[PDB]
Design a binder for this molecule. Sequence first.
Ligand SMILES: Nc1ncnc2c1ncn2[C@@H]1O[C@H](COP(=O)(O)OP(=O)(O)OP(O)(O)=S)[C@@H](O)[C@H]1O
Ligand SMILES: Nc1ncnc2c1ncn2[C@@H]1O[C@H](COP(=O)(O)OP(=O)(O)OP(O)(O)=S)[C@@H](O)[C@H]1O
Ligand SMILES: [Mg+2]
Ligand SMILES: [Mg+2]
Lengths: 223, 333
Amino acid sequence: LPMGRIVEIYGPESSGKTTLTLQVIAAAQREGKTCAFIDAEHALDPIYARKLGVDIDNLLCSQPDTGEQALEICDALARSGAVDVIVVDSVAALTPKAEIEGEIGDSHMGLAARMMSQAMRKLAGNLKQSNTLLIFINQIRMKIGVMFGNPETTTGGNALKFYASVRLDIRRIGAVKEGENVVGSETRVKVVKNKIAAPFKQAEFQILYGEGINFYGELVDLG
Amino acid sequence: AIDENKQKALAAALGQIEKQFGKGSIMRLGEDRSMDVETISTGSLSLDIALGAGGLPMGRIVEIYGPESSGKTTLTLQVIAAAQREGKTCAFIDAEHALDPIYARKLGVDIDNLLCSQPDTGEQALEICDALARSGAVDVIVVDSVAALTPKAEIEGEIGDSHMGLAARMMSQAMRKLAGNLKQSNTLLIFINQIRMKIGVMFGNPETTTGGNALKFYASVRLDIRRIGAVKEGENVVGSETRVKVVKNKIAAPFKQAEFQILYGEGINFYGELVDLGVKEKLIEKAGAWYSYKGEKIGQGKANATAWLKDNPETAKEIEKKVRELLLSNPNS
DNA sequence: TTTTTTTTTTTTTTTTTTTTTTTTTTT
DNA sequence: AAAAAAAAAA
Ligand SMILES: Nc1ncnc2c1ncn2[C@@H]1O[C@H](COP(=O)(O)OP(=O)(O)OP(O)(O)=S)[C@@H](O)[C@H]1O
Ligand SMILES: Nc1ncnc2c1ncn2[C@@H]1O[C@H](COP(=O)(O)OP(=O)(O)OP(O)(O)=S)[C@@H](O)[C@H]1O
Ligand SMILES: [Mg+2]
Ligand SMILES: [Mg+2]
């Protein structure tokens, strides 16, 4: 993954989005780099992060109240020049202040898409100067009034698709069994956008519950 | 020399963030105690083992779904009863308009202290959940059927009028607003969901759940409950044989399952589980259809062995203690 | 040869920004 | 296989 750029990772429920993103952090911390995790979903388990190989004691973590606060912390850490990797867990949970103060049922027409469009404009330049990698996790939603193409879409509007240097589609394609005991997931990643090399290549690997990505399993298949 | 200017730049940035947004706005993950996972009992010992962390996680969202008369409401009332016995406050949002308070009392719920609402719209139901979460004074909220959370525009409208993804949009907005508030208050939110069949499919599961896709993403636990048979007293059907599958888990390994009995008017059969678990850990010897503890022949047939454990509380406590110590991945005492 | 006096009055616009979400058997 | 309605900023 390229330093100083924006990356998007999206997929369905329990496809391994958070697990993949913690393995990037673990690998970067072993090379002396500093990392931050913005947990907008409010669902990070620190003991699981430790089992995957993250140094919990040095990882900066924030659970912000609004989307604006989340993206202002990203800008501040990027300008500092001292953080190498930032992860933002779900764009889908980046709630605008006006929507939090409001009531359930109130319409907020394209307010989240407008905030995201503003954030990309402000961040792209700062990330490139600091040489900081920013990873956005995104969730999938269905679009209505469609027969062509894919009815699948992502959250947060159109800006992120333009500014991302790499976009990754992750999917669970089966179970890893020890006879009866389900012990992990068979996983496929498609590269759907690439600006640093050719796109549309794919990768297959195993995620084992409590260990993470099965390295030696890949080394067999490649050997 | 160069890594020392970085430490200073980082310290300044952390200072500026904490000044702008408040004290605990950014910290190191290892020194954040609010981020530790705390669990409460489900009222079933086999399900507490299947979940891996010894129960359902406080501060998170949980989904329980299944077919008609599978025990969804009964399971949530057993969670509330177990929580009330630890001095926690509990609320029940009855969107189905089908709760019986006499039956709730028989399952062990304190009817006099349980908060209850029968809201008119889905928006009203989800605004009450948000208000109780912000209060900081409620520990467990149950919402009976997502399926019955009707948007205001659909109630004011006529039967036949199309409302394209209006319910799905309301749930997507509710998750965004609630997730953060539930974590700050340390409140557990349980959603009950119904199964619907999907058309235009040949592969996979044609079974779907109601209310759109948002809840699948934000839930920390998802439970599929199913009636697998009858519990008989010769002729009289006295209860249900029940299976729960953990189809999503973020606090331990998923895809474990639990089997137990629901007896009509009592609820979940605790001693019936404790027999089957004590047998599995070699603390109870099973000689064909005979149950024996430490050589002492206690009963023949599961029902008599359960009745024996009932009238001897101390030996039941001894077997519980052992099963708890052994099989739980994270014992908390 | 000798010696200054005193203010008056407004003028005129410029330019958009951004999506969100499924629903249900039928024989 | 056929569908709908939502605002606020220098
Ligand atoms: N603490 C844990 N212990 C054991 N297994 C886990 C844990 N957390 C996640 N997993 C499993 O790892 C697999 C991938 O999980 P994640 O990386 O959390 O996926 P995800 O796409 O981020 O899912 P979300 O955010 O919940 S929609 C799933 O099968 C999980 O059940
Ligand atoms: N008041 C009651 N007295 C005796 N048995 C009951 C009572 N209420 C429910 N039951 C039985 O307990 C079992 C589980 O019922 P529930 O817990 O209501 O299941 P459920 O999935 O909530 O079903 P729904 O909401 O009707 S689709 C069923 O066999 C019921 O008949
Ligand atoms: Mg995740
Ligand atoms: Mg019910």
